[PDB]
Amino acid sequence: AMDWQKITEKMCDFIQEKVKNSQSQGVVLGLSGGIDSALVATLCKRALKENVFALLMPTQISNKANLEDALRLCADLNLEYKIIEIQSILDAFIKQSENTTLVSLGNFAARIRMSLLYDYSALKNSLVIGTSNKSELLLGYGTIYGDLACAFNPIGSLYKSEIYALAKYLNLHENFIKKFSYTKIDEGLKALETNDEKLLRTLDPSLIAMLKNRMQKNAFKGKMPEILE
Amino acid sequence: MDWQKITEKMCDFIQEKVKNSQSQGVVLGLSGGIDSALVATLCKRALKENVFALLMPTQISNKANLEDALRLCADLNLEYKIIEIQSILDAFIKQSENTTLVSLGNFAARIRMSLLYDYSALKNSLVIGTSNKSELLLGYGTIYGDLACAFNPIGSLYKSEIYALAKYLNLHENFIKKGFSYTKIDEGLKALETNDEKLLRTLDPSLIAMLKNRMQKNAFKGKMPEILE
Numbered sequence: 487a488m489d490w491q492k493i494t495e496k497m498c499d500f501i502q503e504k505v506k507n508s509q510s511q512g513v514v515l516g517l518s519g520g521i522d523s524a525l526v527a528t529l530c531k532r533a534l535k536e537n538v539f540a541l542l543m544p545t546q547i548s549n550k551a552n553l554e555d556a557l558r559l560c561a562d563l564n565l566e567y568k569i570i571e572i573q574s575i576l577d578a579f580i581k582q583s584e585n586t587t588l589v590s591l592g593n594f595a596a597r598i599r600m601s602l603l604y605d606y607s608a609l610k611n612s613l614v615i616g617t618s619n620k621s622e623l624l625l626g627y628g629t630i631y632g633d634l635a636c637a638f639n640p641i642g643s644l645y646k647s648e649i650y651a652l653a654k655y656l657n658l659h660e661n662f663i664k665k666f667s668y669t670k671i672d673e674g675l676k677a678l679e680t681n682d683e684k685l686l687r688t689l690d691p692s693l694i695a696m697l698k699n700r701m702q703k704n705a706f707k708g709k710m711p712e713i714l715e
Numbered sequence: 716m717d718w719q720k721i722t723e724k725m726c727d728f729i730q731e732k733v734k735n736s737q738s739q740g741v742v743l744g745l746s747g748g749i750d751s752a753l754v755a756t757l758c759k760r761a762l763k764e765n766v767f768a769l770l771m772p773t774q775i776s777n778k779a780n781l782e783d784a785l786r787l788c789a790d791l792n793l794e795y796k797i798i799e800i801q802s803i804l805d806a807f808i809k810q811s812e813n814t815t816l817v818s819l820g821n822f823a824a825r826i827r828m829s830l831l832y833d834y835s836a837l838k839n840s841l842v843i844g845t846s847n848k849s850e851l852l853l854g855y856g857t858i859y860g861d862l863a864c865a866f867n868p869i870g871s872l873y874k875s876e877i878y879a880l881a882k883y884l885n886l887h888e889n890f891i892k893k894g895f896s897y898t899k900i901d902e903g904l905k906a907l908e909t910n911d912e913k914l915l916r917t918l919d920p921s922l923i924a925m926l927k928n929r930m931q932k933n934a935f936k937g938k939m940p941e942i943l944e
Binding site: 496570574577578581582583584589594597598602604605606616636638639640703708710711712715 | 724725728732737796798800802803805806807809810811812813817818821822825826828829830832833834836837844851858859862863864865866867868869870871935937938939940941942943944
């Protein structure tokens with residue numbers, strides 16, 4: 487357990503600092519209906535008031551709780567937004583692809599969202615604020631140039647488990663929390679990162695072997711392209 | 716300067732990235748420009764059969780760029796695919812609220828990077844970049860567009876050096892047409908980078924003011940997103 491009031495203020499400062507030190511007037515984020523997203527949208531409204539904009543980009547719109555939740559948020563925060571259903575763009579890429587896996591579909595969709603976010607950011611003279619947490623950053627869940635693309639990110643050093651607790655501190659709607667203590671994954675991640683050789687022996691070796699396996703093979707995502715000299 | 720040695724250094728580099736990777740080879744975008752063609756030439760020398768190119772013009776009618784790119788592929792025995800992207804592009808534009816030559820170009824660049832990344836998964840390969848140092852310093856490229864790649868062998872060579880190296884490697888003349896010399900821009904860029912206060916007083920101040928103005932406002936393209944701590 488830690489100091490959320492102080493953490494929150496630190497984050498708002500940081501957000502304000504990026505916008506003041508920039509030629510931009512505000513930020514835009516993608517808002518999917520997940521806890522990270524909603525957290526970042528909350529902080530942004532606290533920090534920037536009217537200068538916030540969200541794109542909601544599901545691939546299909548029918549009856550997904552995610553959209554319900556996303557929209558209930560936008561209305562609640564008085565956040566300006568636009569729903570853009572991306573199946574069409576996605577179909578057009580798929581027709582040019584020679585591979586038809588789901589993984590391939592997810593990667594496209596992630597980069598379609600980044601392209602739209604960036605297009606709107608030029609429109610609105612704004613920065614793109616990232617929403618990846620430290621767990622997903624260490625494990626390389628994201629797509630490079632996908633949801634990993636942004637100008638900055640206030641929550642990139644908080645583990646998933648910390649996100650939950652922070653969200654609870656800020657009274658985010660319960661649907662975010664539904665769908666403090668660290669999970670086993672987060673604790674192993676944290677132990678490895680802080681070389682807590684002490685907790686490490688406590689933990690399950692098979693788990694650690696996989697946590698190590700992931701971060702190793704996906705480290706290139708946190709790095710710039712290597713230019714030869 | 717010593718092209719034979721530079722060539723061999725680059726081939727080593729390219730081989731070193733593929734060996735040290737889970738990947739079997741590389742894939743690049745091939746537009747018909749000198750950088751591209753140069754990189755494709757190096758790749759075939761370095762990796763033989765393990766190279767693949769995507770040619771993604773926005774429209775296909777009778778552009779010399781396509782002729783030149785295809786002439787290259789056949790001549791190098793490079794495996795490739797032509798993907799005309801105007802459909803994907805129409806699909807984005809339809810969701811955009813800001814029509815602008817700049818807006819289009821950016822979508823186009825990010826479409827190409829998405830297809831490159833998709834084919835790279837398909838072929839279990841890395842995406843090799845093709846930006847030269849001049850374009851890197853001046854911030855011509857699109858972030859997460861043509862700036863997105865795993866690595867880049869030519870990112871430290873100025874445009875003027877590209878031309879000379881190309882001439883050394885006997886690239887088809889159409890690339891060169893459209894004892895070497897640096898352009899004014901490149902020499903100013905080089906002078907600034909290497910703090911040659913000596914050549915600097917030689918040069919035109921208006922030029923330098925602009926070179927400085929560019930690199931300053933586009934330095935964020937060479938940097939990762941800033942995460943708050």
